[PDB]
Symmetry: C3
Subunit: 81 residues, 3 copies
């Protein structure tokens, strides 16, 4: 019983039924030193062959993987789904 | 002043009342070569003993450290909160 | 066409016009064995020199590369933008 009230509980309806956003991650492995995430995704980490924990991210999407010898690199990607 | 408008001033009032969620991360550390984020959390990266930077993710939430010898693993775990 | 609806045709259509939230990430690199994210960011992982997979995160913001000889260290940092 009130005009500006109906409008509010009306919102606490839709507001309370939009399902909320969440993180989804996936991995991309590639041969060599470079492994890139798809556009629309951030790189949160890199893994690397030869037990190589030295890596660096290039163009904000690619895992450069940086030791004497490198079979494969890998890029963890995340984003809001 | 217009039958709509007042409505938008109502949405765009107590909508600025919404408290935006933020990333919250945490680590999980286990002996051997596996470490899992509790479900509801994604895995963003892994760490391994023996300076082992070769890992891979198994079953969407599990850090698998993968060098020959291996004593602990940690998963880095993030969630919206 | 009916006057509970006139309302949500604004609600469920300023939600879509809103400001959809997004992840951003970035690396911080420092000589030594430590590296720190700025405030407002979660650490999603670390890199190390001499190829370390072994690292841990302290005080919620500091990559501690934890091998023995240690060049440099890296943190990966993320926030909602
Ligand atoms: Pt994607
Ligand atoms: Pt959790
Ligand atoms: Pt920042």
């Amino acid at each position: 019983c009130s005009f500006e009230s109906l409008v509010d509980q009306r919102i606490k309806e839709a507001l309370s039924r939009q399902e909320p956003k969440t993180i989804s991650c996936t991995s991309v492995t590639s041969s060599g030193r470079l492994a890139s995430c798809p556009a629309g995704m951030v790189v949160t980490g890199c893994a690397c062959g030869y037990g190589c924990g030295s890596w660096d991210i290039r163009n904000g999407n690619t895992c450069h993987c940086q030791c004497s010898v490198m079979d494969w690199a890998s890029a963890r990607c995340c984003r809001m789904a």
